[PDB]
Write a structure and sequence with these properties.
Number of helices of chain A: 8
Chains A, B: Beta-glucuronidase
CATH class of the largest domain in chain A: Alpha Beta
Shape of chain A: globular
Number of strands of chain A: 29
Keywords: alpha/beta barrel, sugar-binding domain, beta-sandwich domain, glycosyl hydrolase, beta-glucuronidase inhibitor, Glycosidase, Hydrolase, HYDROLASE-HYDROLASE INHIBITOR complex
CATH architecture of the largest domain in chain A: Alpha-Beta Barrel
Radius of gyration of chain A: 25 Å
CATH superfamily of the largest domain in chain A: Glycosidases
Organism of A, B: Escherichia coli
PDB class: hydrolase/hydrolase inhibitor
Bound molecules: ligand Z77
Oligomer: part of a larger assembly
Entry title: Structure of E. coli beta-Glucuronidase bound with a novel, potent inhibitor 1-((6,7-dimethyl-2-oxo-1,2-dihydroquinolin-3-yl)methyl)-1-(2-hydroxyethyl)-3-(3-methoxyphenyl)thiourea
Largest interface: A-B, 33 and 32 residues
Distance between the termini of chain A: 50 Å
Chain lengths: 603, 603
Amino acid sequence: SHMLRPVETPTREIKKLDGLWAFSLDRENCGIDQRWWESALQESRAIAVPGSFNDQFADADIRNYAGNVWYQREVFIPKGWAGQRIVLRFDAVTHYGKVWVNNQEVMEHQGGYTPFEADVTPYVIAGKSVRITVCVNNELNWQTIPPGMVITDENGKKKQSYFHDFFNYAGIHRSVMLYTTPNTWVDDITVVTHVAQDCNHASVDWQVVANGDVSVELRDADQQVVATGQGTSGTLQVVNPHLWQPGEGYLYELCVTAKSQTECDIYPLRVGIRSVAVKGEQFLINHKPFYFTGFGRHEDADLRGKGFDNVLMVHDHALMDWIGANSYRTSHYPYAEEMLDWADEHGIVVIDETAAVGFNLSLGIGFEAGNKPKELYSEEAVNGETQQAHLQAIKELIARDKNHPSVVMWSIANEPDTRPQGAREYFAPLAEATRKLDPTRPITCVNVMFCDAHTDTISDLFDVLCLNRYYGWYVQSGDLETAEKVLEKELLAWQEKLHQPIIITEYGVDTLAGLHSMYTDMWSEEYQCAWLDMYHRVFDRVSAVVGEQVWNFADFATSQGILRVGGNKKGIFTRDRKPKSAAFLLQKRWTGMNFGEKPQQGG
Amino acid sequence: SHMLRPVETPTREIKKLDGLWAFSLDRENCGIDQRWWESALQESRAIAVPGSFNDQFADADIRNYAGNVWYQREVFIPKGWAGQRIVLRFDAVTHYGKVWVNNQEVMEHQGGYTPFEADVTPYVIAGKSVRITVCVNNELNWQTIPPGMVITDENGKKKQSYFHDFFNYAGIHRSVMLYTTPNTWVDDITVVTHVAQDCNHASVDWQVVANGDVSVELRDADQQVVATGQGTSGTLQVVNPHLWQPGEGYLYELCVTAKSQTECDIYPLRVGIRSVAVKGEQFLINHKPFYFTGFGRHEDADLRGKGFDNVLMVHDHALMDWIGANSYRTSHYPYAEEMLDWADEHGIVVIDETAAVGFNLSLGIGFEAGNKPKELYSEEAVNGETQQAHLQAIKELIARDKNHPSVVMWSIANEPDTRPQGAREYFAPLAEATRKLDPTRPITCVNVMFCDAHTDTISDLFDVLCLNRYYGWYVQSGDLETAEKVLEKELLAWQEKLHQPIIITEYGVDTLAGLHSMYTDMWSEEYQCAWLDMYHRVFDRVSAVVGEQVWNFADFATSQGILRVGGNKKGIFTRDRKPKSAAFLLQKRWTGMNFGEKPQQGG
Ligand SMILES: COc1cccc(NC(=S)N(CCO)Cc2cc3cc(C)c(C)cc3[nH]c2=O)c1
Ligand SMILES: COc1cccc(NC(=S)N(CCO)Cc2cc3cc(C)c(C)cc3[nH]c2=O)c1
């Protein structure tokens, strides 16, 4: 369906993020049968929203729980909301939600990183209290967007396994809200900026609408009406403009009016005049040779999970700004939109990514019981549904982020195994369909190191080359000397194979803060520094390398294992954001360069 | 040959483990070509002996060197040593060592952990100064104990790889010494102590002499002559005795005299009167069921590597005494004899082990594909020669340690892969040889967990079942509930399969000192505590379990990889001997039991 980011004019919101809700586990899965949502959850306790449920209670049994949990809370609908449109919206519900307003089932959602909403006017009465009950599921299976497998034990209980690193946080991770609309209402919008050698340029509106006529007006930074359009379906305004750029990120505001003889609906959609596409081995934003810096990130932090948080947000960006990141990627799931609004506002370049992670079964590291399906693409394991579920996941992200100028690229998935058979048959359609959803931006699929330049059957189908590489770490462990060869050899081997522009979307080594070594070896701070030094030395000797993003901005939490010391320790910063000695090395390189500019194959 | 430990009676040492020697690498392998023993080493820096060489200089390139190194040093023969048998002895040179006295090659030994000595009188002049060059080699191959594979890259640069955890430290790890005897001298002794429901018994004695009549007397603790003996290679002495006992290890002293017509020799051998035997599922010391507590340990510490050190020894023994440990295993190689004299004197029970770890090609870390012989027991890999070099390692160990009453059993190997056929072919004759070499102690071979009760092909050939188990950590990771079911089922399978006594000789988890967690998950101090505790509950349920040796006394250096965060962290103590909180857990369990005695299945 249609997603529009709420803002506040002929519409206003009660955020329900007001944190404390009633909470409970349903270890018997008797909750739907016993119709829990008709009265107050019993045996509950306070929980905060937004945040993951897992770590709020310091309890392993809750942390590793799998199945359904219940959220409940009450809330007076504002008196002024008349006969108006009342709309309940969740920015995310991690993995799956079902919603009961008093007794009315109003909503259902699968996907954990994108919004869903419903018109609730008929079971609500403005000026009165209404119960809100949410049922939340955190289970993953094969047609799910990260896939996974729930093993039920003989003894009654579930237990989740899956194929990615990062830990399976679940819950209401983002803002909920009740919001208000006129019965005339904008409900969809799309916008495209074309650029021309940097002198002048044009933007297209298209806009689905609740019944009404659209006056479309584009405003200055200073609110001077410099673009006007008529029509409820389409326009193009060719004004000679001020562009969205990386150092600075200028933005226009396109108000959107939908009219009836009774009503009016007014919408400001921030807009960045920017063009994105690839030319040969170059990446082009406003027809310029960019160079990417920054990291893969996660939504992870002590206590809250992947739960959204303003302070955290403000601090991390301060940190990225300081250290010279111009860009980052939404590692392995759609992030809360606020990050993107900030990126636009601040001109930060974003490779936007779907939750399609862990399609891979070789990854890995198993001393344990094998199964585990034999064929990756099978009706058993990655199947028809799964391509369809996956398709739907790509719609939504694009539905949400097409209008965010900061997004210069889409990412279809991260590290799928492309050595098994259906791997090109699975990936070709979605690659086509992606561009049929948005042809304004290039599209990639992020590449695991064992589908290497001679074995990977999928890369031509995409526009840019996104590599995750560990050459001294998982292989050649500890050996910078031979690691540098393999890496360059393999970067050159990609350059000729595909003659595409190359970005390393993951390069990094586990490092324990405070571990220091005169022998400069694995897990030491010094080693991280030497290893990043080297990867760097090597992108300076390759023309096709136009992007660099460090494995992890900060240490995050993982599934429990032998290869993870209390989590992934590959952060430049610790989880509480204290900088490892490598923050200061990246500091120099990233602020020493010219903005958006590769070195002189040296410096 | 014959090995007796030098002491000071007619006999006299000049230590010369005075440790400042000259030192250098040989990178182009010129050393034997250019007869370096002939002239004082060039480009030679000072190094401490005893010590491992790898860590004294804070240089990665020296630390990771593979090849040949040289130790050189001048000494003074005491003028007093006039008519004298002058012997040059090395307590260990790690892996192989070749020795020159001033352009006269006197020795060569392969093995890194037991002594070799030469009668050098004719190449030295009492009261003059000599130059001593040692060429030490640290490489491993399929015939070395332990085995390994040096890999030479395309450049001729050698790189050692091996199949055990701990770091290949090399160098002169133990004292060197010149020592003296008369030309009539005892050069081998053997003692067997017998006992019968404990009121009084005998000690058979076998004595090999260099040119003399032998006589023999048994002196008391307070030095009074409790019995007497005459004859050369045969005697037996009877006694009403204070047995050597795990708590306290009472010691008589046997006094050996070799008499010529002219010359005289005197050798004191400490004797502990005690019997050791398996009876069914029990391990009997002086006819009483005993229960082992304590550690597998390593020879490792900062800076010195495996270099022996007195302060370190006294400190670790205060720690083990404090914590309630009554025993250990010389994990992985023979330890400094000093370690066994200590045991003898304080009544510590020891499991003495060869350096034959690494027989297995199946404990790989992941995914560096290559490449290792596909058949473990094959002419390419573990072959007739290997079995010889292994038999030799057994001989040398027993020759050294046979009179140590603290040694109660011999372990022949640690974690060989016993699945491949011919495992049994390879070990049966070693088992047999070992018993013949010393008929007085039970024998074992430490068992790796993926050779399990149903797959192992070797354990019926040995007397005591020693198991290295990691359920909850390498397998069932993090899951105590299910680790515990699997541990118990497996221990019961072994009891029913073999009806031998079971000692768990490794159980432990990596624990980063200072990582604390409410979730009690994998790398935290709390997990280390809960995991050992679960293991303990199960041991107390299984009647064949007769001992527990926690895997690591202290953290230790390993080769680099993704599984070892700067070493093995299964320490109870850190490498600098600081206690982790599991230290106090073990302390309570071990000092709270009745000494030497299995709990009652209960707290
Ligand atoms: C199931 O969730 C988990 C749990 C714990 C660790 C991981 N690891 C992950 S995601 N990575 C991918 C790094 O971008 C490490 C990894 C690399 C790797 C490389 C090669 C060349 C091979 C042959 C096998 C490999 N196996 C691996 O595991 C995943
Ligand atoms: C630095 O030296 C290195 C280098 C690389 C790896 C290691 N790992 C080591 S020593 N172990 C200790 C085993 O007692 C972990 C281990 C457990 C294991 C368990 C099962 C059940 C199976 C089937 C396979 C397994 N493989 C393993 O490797 C050590």
